[PDB]
């Protein structure tokens, strides 16, 4: 009941959708680290 | 017709462009095939403006 036939345009849009969310993750969580106590104090370190 | 610069001057004037297009949020005509000031822009993009 909860599956939507999407036609192929809507699908694409979706896929398209998804890989900007993936990039939004993985850029975030990079920021997350980059933006940590551990990684500042050994970046300073070094 | 295709260059180089100085990487101090490329990283700088590259980072500039791009964070003025992510405030005005802008169209950037270029000429599109990858050589020269198109090809230093393309790099300058995919320097910052490829992580905001």
């Known amino acids: ?46 | 017709q295709n260059f180089e610069l100085q990487p101090k001057l490329k990283q700088v004037f590259g980072k500039g462009l791009i964070k003025a297009a992510m405030t005005t949020g802008a169209w950037i005509f270029t000429g599109g095939v990858n050589t020269g000031v198109i090809r230093h822009v393309g790099d300058a993009l995919k320097d910052h403006a490829s992580k905001s």
């Open chain 1, 1 to 46: 009941g909860l599956k939507l036939f999407i036609t192929d345009d809507e699908l694409k849009k979706v896929h398209d959708f998804e890989e900007q969310c993936i990039e939004e993750y993985f850029r975030e969580k990079d920021d997350r680290f980059n933006s940590s106590n551990d990684e500042r104090i050994r970046v300073t370190s070094e």
